[PDB]
Design an enzyme around this catalytic site. Structure first.
Site, PDB file in Angstrom:
ATOM      1  N   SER A 149       1.097  -1.185  -0.114  1.00  0.00           N
ATOM      2  CA  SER A 149       0.153   0.416   0.030  1.00  0.00           C
ATOM      3  C   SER A 149       0.602   1.113   0.494  1.00  0.00           C
ATOM      4  O   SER A 149       1.097   2.125  -0.959  1.00  0.00           O
ATOM      5  CB  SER A 149      -0.660   0.012   1.178  1.00  0.00           C
ATOM      6  OG  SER A 149      -1.365   1.202   1.378  1.00  0.00           O
ATOM      7  N   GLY A 150       1.714   1.804   0.868  1.00  0.00           N
ATOM      8  CA  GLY A 150       2.397   2.425   1.133  1.00  0.00           C
ATOM      9  C   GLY A 150       3.344   3.033  -0.420  1.00  0.00           C
ATOM     10  O   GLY A 150       4.051   4.230  -0.114  1.00  0.00           O
ATOM     11  N   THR A 164      -0.775   5.360  -6.480  1.00  0.00           N
ATOM     12  CA  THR A 164      -1.619   5.924  -7.035  1.00  0.00           C
ATOM     13  C   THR A 164      -1.334   7.392  -8.178  1.00  0.00           C
ATOM     14  O   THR A 164      -2.128   7.472  -8.963  1.00  0.00           O
ATOM     15  CB  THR A 164      -2.488   7.304  -4.774  1.00  0.00           C
ATOM     16  OG1 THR A 164      -3.483   7.551  -5.612  1.00  0.00           O
ATOM     17  CG2 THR A 164      -1.475   7.715  -5.441  1.00  0.00           C
ATOM     18  N   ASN A 221       1.838   7.014   5.384  1.00  0.00           N
ATOM     19  CA  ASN A 221       1.431   7.741   3.570  1.00  0.00           C
ATOM     20  C   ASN A 221       0.935   9.123   4.926  1.00  0.00           C
ATOM     21  O   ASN A 221       0.329   8.825   5.812  1.00  0.00           O
ATOM     22  CB  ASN A 221       1.069   7.300   2.612  1.00  0.00           C
ATOM     23  CG  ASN A 221       1.846   8.170   2.023  1.00  0.00           C
ATOM     24  OD1 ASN A 221       1.566   9.877   1.824  1.00  0.00           O
ATOM     25  ND2 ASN A 221       1.242   7.621   0.259  1.00  0.00           N
ATOM     26  N   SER A 259      -3.849   7.513   1.190  1.00  0.00           N
ATOM     27  CA  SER A 259      -2.740   5.901   1.438  1.00  0.00           C
ATOM     28  C   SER A 259      -4.777   5.694   0.360  1.00  0.00           C
ATOM     29  O   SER A 259      -4.737   6.150   0.313  1.00  0.00           O
ATOM     30  CB  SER A 259      -3.398   5.346   2.570  1.00  0.00           C
ATOM     31  OG  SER A 259      -1.903   5.040   2.856  1.00  0.00           O
ATOM     32  N   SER A 260      -3.911   5.252  -0.725  1.00  0.00           N
ATOM     33  CA  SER A 260      -4.996   4.718  -1.425  1.00  0.00           C
ATOM     34  C   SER A 260      -5.575   3.771  -0.967  1.00  0.00           C
ATOM     35  O   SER A 260      -4.777   2.792   0.276  1.00  0.00           O
ATOM     36  CB  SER A 260      -4.322   4.057  -2.728  1.00  0.00           C
ATOM     37  OG  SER A 260      -3.396   3.110  -2.468  1.00  0.00           O
ATOM     38  N   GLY A 268      -0.495  -5.341  -2.517  1.00  0.00           N
ATOM     39  CA  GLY A 268       0.236  -6.330  -2.338  1.00  0.00           C
ATOM     40  C   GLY A 268      -0.616  -7.308  -1.228  1.00  0.00           C
ATOM     41  O   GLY A 268      -1.418  -7.781  -0.699  1.00  0.00           O
ATOM     42  N   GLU A 322      -1.353  -8.290   2.083  1.00  0.00           N
ATOM     43  CA  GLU A 322      -0.903  -7.508   3.145  1.00  0.00           C
ATOM     44  C   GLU A 322      -0.240  -8.712   4.652  1.00  0.00           C
ATOM     45  O   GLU A 322      -1.941  -9.680   4.914  1.00  0.00           O
ATOM     46  CB  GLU A 322      -2.267  -6.986   3.484  1.00  0.00           C
ATOM     47  CG  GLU A 322      -2.937  -6.258   2.564  1.00  0.00           C
ATOM     48  CD  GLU A 322      -2.022  -4.896   2.756  1.00  0.00           C
ATOM     49  OE1 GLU A 322      -0.557  -4.668   2.920  1.00  0.00           O
ATOM     50  OE2 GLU A 322      -2.762  -3.745   3.122  1.00  0.00           O
TER      51      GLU A 322
END
Length: 758
Positions: A180-181, A185, A232, A235-236, A456, A458
């Site tokens: 995620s990080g 996006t 972040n 974050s998306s 990805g 998690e």
């Protein structure tokens, strides 16, 4: 300054700027060196020592500190002729293990060059810094240009995706996915732009509405969809295929975005240094003192759906004005000046809803002492008080063939407005997308380019029901790659003649998936569904049944030794550990029809249109009534994959460099951790033993011609001019099979020829 050479916007923080001096003095290679991990305790952070040994059975070398311990040629990570530093597509490497690539990937980074290649795989590690590599000239250097003729880029898979279609006329896919990080996006945030401009409709500089009416349709998304976490500032927060169409000539036409899973929990609850969906602050922080009491907020601090976890103090960038942007974006992609007030009329009834404190009723019976939150809270959605509150604490349950008004204690009235407070956000939003989608939305739609923004693996000890779905889709994916890139050796074998004693590699993971969504023999999602059917189910059972079906019966399932509330699966990349708890309830997302009944009507064409449309308040009424989040999450990925499976793909991976938002440091503790996380390196190291530094093919003419006397430049053609060399000198023919038409120097059979500098 023409695009050719060095000295401008491009070569500087984009292209590894070659030198003004021409000859082979840029470097020269001899001898060898091995990578290694100084401490036999840590499996990260290696080093570099010179070999002195060449053992047949073993391998041995030198060290910086004293020790001179040895290493099997097979467990040794070699280091390349340091002639490849910032090599643009890494396949071109000679030796490859890990350190050998967290290295090539760092130099590529030391110079601030986030973008790289893995043959088919673009790796892109988020910088956190601001590096102009997008400006309008970064564009006119790409458009209509070949992957070879330009340094790597998002603009360099983003055009290819476009051109191939134009010519290799077929629907096209882009798949971006990262921890995620990773900033994935912004990546997507550009393909849309890039495409949008080249197929951008005006004379030379402009674009008339539509092509723009789109650009502002993310602010909406980012506004609610994206939100800020430890990982972040934005974050998306959700998965989606934003995906777009054109007319055949080449000019962009349409868009259709479908989203899915969201941390609907991020509304009621967030933690240390965390905040909410930004729609929430710019809401209060931005509405003129006018509308602020037109509905009554006053303090945002004054609220507990916002004043809990620390930092709401809104770091870095300004928002007070970011409001004039989102609000300036909705009625630009066209959003009514009256109804889009309701969005607001809503975001606040939510807030007042996280403020009521049902206090233990005398004896029992939980109840609120006084009330103005709820009185107010009802006074924007427009729903009668002796109604709203009553369905809340006094919800009418149905025991057998009679049904009555149970009175909740706190233990449960507590979590009702908690669960109803997402049913709206979760809801409004879903439909909220439902709107703009259905006018950027298209009809015949000749072609399309869909792009995928997914996560990805998690992986955490705290993963639960959610962790699975996203991870079920992920597995689902790495076969699409492995299988797709399989059919790669399909053509490959129609032009190098006879083909490899072959794998016939099929899904090494039809297995794991089958364990999750397996019909018969059934899987985790079957029993999940099967029991979700009534109450006398105590997740206690849920796990007990599983270990019965699965334990010691499936290669991928493992039963913990002492732990009982949880289990573990062996996913594509190593094991995952799912604990159970409310899987049985999280599987439904229940809510009293005493409440819908209370909100299924109102003053308000939308909160009526929210619990009034069958595609917004429901899912297809199958097996007699609602199908479960488990059954559905199956119905729609497959459909998605179905679609995927009929388009050409291009995978992009987003590597998070570090965990504190720091541009600068780049810790091997993470990057590496995930390098393996993706089939990026092992994507070939296993797969393309066979053809090495896969050149622009068989082009032996003036490209490399310093060999002394015997191997010249242009004899008759781009293929033969010296062939009786390895059959002769060095060793035999084997290194290179001889397909009638093509062939490949297997570099892997070199140790008698090419290491020195002349």
């Amino acid at each position: 300054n023409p695009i050719h050479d060095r000295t401008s916007d491009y070569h500087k923080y984009l292209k590894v700027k070659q030198g003004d001096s021409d000859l082979f003095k840029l470097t020269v290679s001899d001898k060898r060196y091995i990578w290694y991990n100084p401490d036999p305790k840590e499996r990260d952070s290696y080093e570099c020592g010179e070999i002195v040994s060449e053992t047949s059975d073993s391998f041995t070398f030198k060290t910086v500190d004293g020790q001179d311990r040895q290493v099997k040629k097979d467990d040794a990570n070699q280091r390349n002729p340091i002639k490849f530093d910032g090599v643009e597509d890494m396949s071109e490497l000679s030796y490859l293990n890990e350190p050998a690539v967290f290295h090539n990937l760092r130099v590529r980074y030391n110079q601030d060059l986030i973008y790289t290649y893995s043959g088919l795989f673009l790796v892109a590690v988020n910088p956190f810094k601001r590096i102009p590599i997008y400006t309008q000239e970064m564009v006119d250097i790409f458009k209509g240009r070949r992957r070879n003729e330009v340094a790597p880029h998002i603009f360099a898979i983003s055009d290819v995706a476009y051109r191939s279609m134009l010519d290799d006329r077929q629907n096209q896919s882009l798949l971006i996915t990262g921890e995620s990080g990773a900033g994935k996006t912004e990546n997507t945030k550009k393909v849309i732009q890039y495409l949008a401009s080249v197929a951008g409709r005006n004379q030379a500089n402009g674009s008339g509405v539509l092509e723009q009416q789109i650009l502002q349709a993310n602010p909406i998304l980012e506004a609610f969809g994206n939100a800020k976490t430890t990982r972040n500032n934005n974050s998306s927060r959700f998965g989606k295929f934003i995906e777009i169409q054109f007319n055949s000539a080449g000019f962009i036409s349409g868009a259709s975005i479908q989203s899915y899973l969201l941390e609907k929990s991020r509304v009621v609850f967030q933690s240390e240094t965390e905040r909410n969906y930004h729609i929430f602050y710019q809401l209060l922080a931005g509405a003129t003192a006018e509308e602020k009491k037109a509905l009554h907020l006053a303090g945002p601090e004054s609220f507990n759906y916002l004043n809990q976890s620390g930092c709401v103090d809104i770091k870095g960038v300004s928002d007070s004005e970011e409001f004039k942007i989102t609000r300036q974006a909705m009625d630009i992609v066209g959003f009514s000046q009256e109804e889009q007030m309701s969005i607001f009329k809503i975001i606040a009834g939510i807030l007042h809803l996280g403020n009521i404190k049902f206090e233990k009723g005398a004896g029992e019976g939980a109840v609120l002492k006084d009330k103005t939150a709820l009185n107010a809270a009802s006074t924007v959605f427009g729903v009668n008080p002796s109604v709203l509150e009553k369905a809340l604490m006094e919800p009418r349950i149905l025991a057998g063939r009679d049904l009555v008004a149970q009175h909740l204690n706190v233990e449960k009235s507590s979590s009702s407005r908690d669960a109803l407070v997402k049913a709206l956000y979760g809801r409004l939003f879903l439909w909220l997308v439902k709107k703009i989608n259905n006018v950027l939305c298209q009809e015949r739609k000749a072609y399309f380019i869909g792009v995928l923004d997914i996560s990805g693996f998690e992986i955490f000890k705290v993963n639960s029901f959610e962790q699975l779905c996203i991870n079920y889709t992920n597995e689902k994916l790495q076969q699409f790659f492995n299988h797709h890139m399989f059919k790669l050796e399909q053509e490959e074998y129609l032009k190098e003649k006879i083909n490899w004693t072959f794998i016939d590699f099929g899904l090494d993971s039809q297995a794991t998936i089958d364990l999750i969504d397996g019909r018969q023999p059934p899987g985790i999602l079957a029993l999940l569904d099967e029991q979700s059917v009534f109450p006398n189910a105590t997740d206690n059972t849920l796990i007990t049944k599983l270990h019965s079906h699965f334990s010691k019966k499936n290669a991928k399932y493992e039963e913990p030794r002492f732990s009982k509330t949880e289990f573990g699966v062996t996913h594509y990349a190593g094991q995952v550990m799912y604990e159970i708890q409310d899987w049985l309830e999280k599987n439904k997302d229940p809510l009293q029809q005493d409440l819908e009944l209370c909100f299924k009507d109102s003053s308000d064409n939308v909160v009526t249109k929210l619990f009034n449309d069958p595609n917004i308040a429901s899912r297809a009424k199958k097996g007699a009534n609602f199908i479960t989040v488990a059954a559905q999450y199956k119905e729609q990925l497959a459909s998605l994959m179905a679609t995927l499976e009929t388009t050409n793909p291009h995978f992009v991976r987003c590597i998070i460099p570090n965990n504190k938002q720091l541009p600068a440091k780049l810790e091997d503790k993470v990057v590496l951790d995930q390098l393996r996380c993706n089939v990026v390196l092992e994507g070939i190291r296993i797969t393309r033993k066979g053809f090495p530094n896969r050149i622009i093919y068989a082009d032996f003419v003036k490209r490399y011609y310093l060999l002394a006397p015997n191997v010249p430049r242009d004899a008759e053609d781009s293929q033969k001019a010296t062939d009786a060399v390895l059959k002769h000198l060095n060793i035999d023919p084997e290194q290179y099979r001889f397909g009638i038409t093509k062939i490949f120097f297997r570099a892997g059979q070199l140790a008698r020829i090419e290491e020195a500098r002349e």
